[PDB]
Amino acid sequence: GAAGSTLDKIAKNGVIVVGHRESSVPFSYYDNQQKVVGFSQDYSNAIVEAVKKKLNKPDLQVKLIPITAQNRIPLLQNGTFDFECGSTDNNVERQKQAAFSDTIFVVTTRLLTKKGGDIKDFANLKDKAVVVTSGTTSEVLLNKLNEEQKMNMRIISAKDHGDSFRTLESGRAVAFMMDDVLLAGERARAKKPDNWEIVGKPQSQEAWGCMLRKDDPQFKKLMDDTIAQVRTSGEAEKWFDKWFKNPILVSHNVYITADKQKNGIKANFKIRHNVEDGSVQLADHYQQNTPIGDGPVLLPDNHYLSTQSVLSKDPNEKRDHMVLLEFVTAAGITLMSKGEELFTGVVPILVELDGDVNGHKFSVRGEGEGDATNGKLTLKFICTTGKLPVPWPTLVTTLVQCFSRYPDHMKQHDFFKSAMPEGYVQERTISFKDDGTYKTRAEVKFEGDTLVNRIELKGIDFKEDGNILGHKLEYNFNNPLNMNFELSDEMKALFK
Amino acid sequence: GSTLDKIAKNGVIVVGHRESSVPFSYYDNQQKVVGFSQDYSNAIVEAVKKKLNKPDLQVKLIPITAQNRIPLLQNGTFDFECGSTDNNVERQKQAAFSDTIFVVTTRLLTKKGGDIKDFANLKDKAVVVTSGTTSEVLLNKLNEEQKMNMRIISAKDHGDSFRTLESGRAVAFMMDDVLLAGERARAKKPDNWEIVGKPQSQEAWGCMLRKDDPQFKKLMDDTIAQVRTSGEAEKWFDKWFKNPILVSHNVYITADKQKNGIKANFKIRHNVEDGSVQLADHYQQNTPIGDGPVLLPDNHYLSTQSVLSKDPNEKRDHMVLLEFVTAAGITLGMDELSMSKGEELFTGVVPILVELDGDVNGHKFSVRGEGEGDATNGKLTLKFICTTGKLPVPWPTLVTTLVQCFSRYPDHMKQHDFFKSAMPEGYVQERTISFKDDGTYKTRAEVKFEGDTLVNRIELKGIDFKEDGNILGHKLEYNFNNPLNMNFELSDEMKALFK
């Protein structure tokens, strides 16, 4: 058979081509910024890093390409990609065409259906439209059940799992059959996740592995070693808790460019606020910052800030309020001044905002602390004038980028700290799609030991029953997904 | 101390600028401060950098108005300003002036075909003027001396003054004639407006600086003299007054290392025939067609300008395009005052073929373009034809869809040129273009060499467009980059100045 390895081909070419799935949630799927993410993609990344160390090629490139259940094996055999980790069952029939790593997940094949409907088990599918994803194990099982039991099902074959779920969600099928965890994943992305139930006696139990070409023991050994190390280091259980037991967030990217004319910077970015009906409210941000002082600043090369925030409520606070936890890291440039020295400890923060939106006047006061070493903010905001006339999430970006974590190799690009203590003016236009606009002007500076953000906000042209003045936005940030899925006994055994 | 002493101490020169003195010192639609006088301001800054041996001197532009320019100069809030300030004896008591950079007369702007033919026609009428200007003094003086009973509306800056006139809330706007021509150029309908009236005065503009600083005055006067005799002053006049003024677009690029590619985002503003603007938000992702190594960039941007024209011998629906693109956003380092194989494919002139098939709200169409690209100069020249008859969308909405491998990457940035590095195998370019209050284009293109020709083959799908919106309604001007075209003669006094 083969005398060489895909590892030798990778080393020659300088790139590893990795297949990935498009809608295997939360394992290998596109997030709303088209990043390929998930539990299996974490294994894929670990394997890629293991290939880089094994080949001593620290600058190896990666090229992720999309595959489907239908085309994964033909594209593997003709060399279109080198391996994939996503949601592929290891079985005997497939071992005739491909090789598999050791198992990374174990599932059972079940049904997703509307809560409170007639579908309790597979027997309820008689004479009904049932959706299943083309090219999958469940498609084979569902057709076989339909034929062997003469159930008169109308089996709809959809191109990928999100399409299958949206067939169910729109009423064109009474149930979706698939791996139970993938049903839970599509449910998490639904308009109303809590309307959907997993039901039915399992038709099978399956084990997922990474797929690679046959006759490559060196590459499979590197994968199996990597999987073994992920387990015994505790990372496998930590990745499970990450994807299945905590909110899954999508980072925002604040794109920064120098504005040398003004000795400052500009930025642009988009926020997508979740709407209660399952849609999204786009908020387009334009930003300009100029230093208050007339001394030197750091004028950055282009880069971006990667941001995630968590909103919560203080159970002992009766005023209208928001508790905020925020994490920000600078990126976009590949690998002590006075201003930067001001941020080496924990710095108290004060925020004051005076707002007028469509004539509705309000004020907000916030206090907390920031830890730029860790890119971390913790703040509590109160509406001091009574009820806030807009949703708290629409004010998050307005309510101190000097607390971003700049990596050591990027510290010469940190405009925000360099303007301290005298500070900077931050101005934004925030354009809400199909609705009004906020215009903001803030001064961010030190007053004594405290970092103060004092803002004026003016909002115009809002729709009184739109998503903002109508209070139709969910109290969250970064478009969370929250899985509802039990750690099974089989998975517990896998982790030993 | 002196102004240079302050600049040297701080490492920053603080430059006052006007906000609406068109086309001398004004904000363009990307908030950049531009104009004929700002070209002088930049020349002065560069002379200060050279004099102080501080190539990394920083610049801080701060806005000033006709009302606050002198007090902010006096208390040191800024160091100098080049804009539109008259030099006169009264102001010399408060400030020093450079040698003259422009000469104007004070006149009126009014609606073409109206009753305002000269200053006498203003009797009993509303007249607008900018607060704190020479014209405001002259207009009030004329009012009282000739008992004209004008209602003088005093607006905060020249754009506000003009929009008072444009919106019918005054019958005329008095100002420096060239500033009237500048505000006209930005109007909803520039050709509706006429400059009339016997000049009330002739004025000379200079750059303002603090009094009793002869060395800083000499640096500015020396720079202004060099601009004249080097011919730059006449070239700047031609640039600002006899050629279209464009705004550049910035294409903001970030790496997408997962896909061995890049993403980009940027905004295009299309001029609408009624004077409004149609926003087109661009999201972009590129991936290499080949599986071999590429250049993965740090964040940077492409600075783009385009000129659309018509071929007078072409009877088909068509667009002639000239485009210039330069990469920017990574500073040339103090210590430095081919990176891919594909880069070598662009050292000379490369022929280009573009093929687009479109479907917008069910209206199908095809476009074919041919021309050539010169990446050494960041320059493209193409002619496009609609091969299916009439184009069902405006040509400007297709410009961004219809080869960023022809961008000029400065030498210090060549390691960030993903586009050329993916050749000859090429790349896939996908976009979502969202037209504000209207529909969306989704595009997928392959850009690659086919033999010696760089080929861009595109599929475009448009949905949710309004049939009477700006796109399907064909309400967009045939231009790009939001041009302004001055209508202003070179006077004999300006010719004298250029000697």
Ligand SMILES: N[C@@H](CC(=O)O)C(=O)O
């Ligand atoms: N695990 C199933 C479904 C999938 O791949 O998404 C299969 O291997 O066919």
Ligand SMILES: N[C@@H](CC(=O)O)C(=O)O
């Ligand atoms: N040139 C006039 C108007 C202006 O400054 O814009 C003045 O000096 O007041």
Ligand SMILES: [Mg+2]
């Ligand atoms: Mg939801």
Ligand SMILES: [Mg+2]
């Ligand atoms: Mg009199």
Ligand SMILES: [Mg+2]
């Ligand atoms: Mg126009």
